[model samples]
Target: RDQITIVGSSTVFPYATVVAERFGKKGFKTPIIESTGTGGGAKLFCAGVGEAHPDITNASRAMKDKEKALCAKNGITDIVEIIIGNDGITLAYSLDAEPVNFTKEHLYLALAKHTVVDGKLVDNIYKNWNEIDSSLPNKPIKVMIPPGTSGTRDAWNSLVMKKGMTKEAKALYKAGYAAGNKKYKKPQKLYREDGLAIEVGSLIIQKLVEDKDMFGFFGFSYYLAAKDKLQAASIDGGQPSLESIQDYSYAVARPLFFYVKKAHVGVIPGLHEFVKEFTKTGTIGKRGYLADIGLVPLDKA
Candidate 1:
């Protein structure tokens, strides 16, 4: 009985947990999994060297060049990136709040302040949803966002931020966004003080469930976790679903990944076998067992 280790994005935790469970039932020893934020997990995996490292690092995003360089520094270079399936990043509000859908414009105003549109932060104030549309509710809005290190953040920026910008404004935003990245080196700066930028965690969503008017952004899985307690807002006119995400109809849908240390492929007993099994005809594909648990199967046609 050999135990493998995995650490990475919280977004990947549920997927990893399902894999580990199936692996254990098949007689392979259970694996130890950690849901450390994506960046933190990669640091540990890369530092494991030859003897200490995780067999796989489940990531919400592909390893960056800096992370790859760190792996090279630690002499852990063999890595394989796998796309498990698409994940939908979503926005939700407590059920007690009046049910309402949001357009792309609503999301932009809700999430950013001093937003650099065309390389300049527009001196406009979005105090409420009605500011964007007077017909909307007048209640104050709060948004809880995942930290920058999380893959969910990257997806949100890509699917929501960059996509929402106008063609000309998007180019300007791209340039200004990079500069903002340089100015704020930390993961927390992704969310400004004027906007709600809470880190991803069960507790935060839990609080959102309790707050009548609270709204937050997190992975679709979190929305599932709290669906019994809160309501997921429909993006534009579409609801969050596997079909929507697969067809790009789901505005928040994006891929999830698992990065394996290829050097350890045959070194660990049961590790290779389990990964092969997990990826084969399982959650990653249509009708796979993992799809029932909030995972959008990869072969959606």
Candidate 2:
């Protein structure tokens, strides 16, 4: 087929699809964009150097070092990564639920697999809001999180969980290193395995709307669309507004990106043209259509 193929980031899927729609009208085959989570897409994108693999991969997080190594290993070394814009990882609750304000520390307490207690790392035990903090609501810690495969989890770990980690938790990772655990990953990324993750994006939204105690998080664009059904929680006293996300005052803000496989540039019809169209001033600039669709604009895209 002469059509271009793209994958990754449920958060970046909407923007990519919009770009594909407009690009298709320009006498090119519409790029097929799939909502494979970022981590999953990286595996396919770096699988091999042939037309069989995807020509591009959209990401809500920057491609990690491991992905780069995978590409090099598979002869997919010639790649161009583009930063599209910003997306605030929004924690939203249904309007039917008792609205609760939250902080990074609070979220860490609720979702983390382990936390420091009395200088010792222990399982996170608080099942309800009040058990963790007296000021919080009586709601249970029921959140419909995205699958661990998503870049939304990456941003949440980097921007929220890491920020909330206590000094004692840092010492744990350091001490583990001293004991020869080279990859003493901080407990920040280890979310509880209690069936909290929902793979379907729309289903998560539906569940949030129906379950009063349920909460969910996703890209700011989704939060904007679901505003009538759900309300954004104030994370660290900053709401996930356009200003807060653009300035990164919203604690969970992350840079969205996409990687273009250079091997497919001349090989795939309109691959280069599609890349140019996505990065054009009319596409990614402050006044771009992407911004109009709730992607926080970059000062200089």
Candidate 3:
């Protein structure tokens, strides 16, 4: 088909569209893009290389082994990975609320369904922000979450949750292993189904704005766009600025990516043109549109 199709993370949507618009000005039909999310895009991208499939997929995190296995199972192995930039996961609260500082433990304690309490794993009992720590505003522990399939969600799980798991909690997993639960080897994969884990979709920001007592999470771009409306809670005393994210000082920062179906480069008329426009110095580089829009650009190499 003449039109190139792209699908993936909501976090990467705006960046992708900016390139598509610039490419459109060069006379190719602007690529059709979708915010189907990282995991969803992987499924569709791995389905086949046929015209019906997307030519590109965006991810806020690297492709997982399971996803790569899916691609192999479907005979779609010749994919090219592109590093878009870096993004810090922002756990933002309404500007109406007082500022708050969060350590990784606060994030895990506030959201996990179960956590080790007095040497035993128990259902999370935190009911309010102050219950976790006195420094935070005494609001109900309300945080709107992104979808499980989004790469944004994956980063939060890895960067925020894992780091937050206390030594007491890790001990519980070890005990389970000693008890002969062979599958306990991957205890980190434990599901956290507390109220904070299921808010879902694009409505989080709007909800957070309306509810001053609530919290919400997003890629840095969304948080940056909403900076006037929301206040980012410091994680590990590091704020989610471009400088902090790029320098690895921000506790929950992660890399962003897009995958290419190399097979489509020749068959699809404008794939090379679109990729060029996306990767060209003026686009993903430090002084580019993406950086202006809040994507932490790559370091000067």
In candidate 1, where is summed lDDT lowest over 10 consecutive residues?
A: 183-192
Error at 123, model 1, angstroms: 7.4
TM-score, predicted candidate 1 vs. hidden true structure = 0.86
lDDT of 2 by residue, 214-271 (tens): 8888789998988888888889988888888888887888899999999898888899
Predict model 1's lDDT versus the native.
0.73
Instruction: Give the per-residue lDDT digits (tens) of candidate 3, residues 156-261.
Output: 8788877887788777878888899785555554555666555566457678878887887878898888878888989998889989889888898788899999
Q: Can you write out model 1's per-residue Cα lDDT over 1-301, one digit (the tens) per residue?
A: 2688889888889888988888888878888899887887888889956747788887777787899999999888778888888788778778777778787756766665445544565633566777767867887767777776776676676667655644554455456657775533322223446545445446776788677777777677777877877777888887887788778688777788888887777777787887787788755688787777778877644
Order the candidates by lDDT, highest first: 2, 3, 1
Per-candidate local distance difference test: 0.73, 0.84, 0.84
lDDT accuracy of residue 109 in candidate 3: 81
The TM-scores, one per candidate, come to 0.86, 0.94, 0.94
Better of 1 and 2 by TM-score: 2
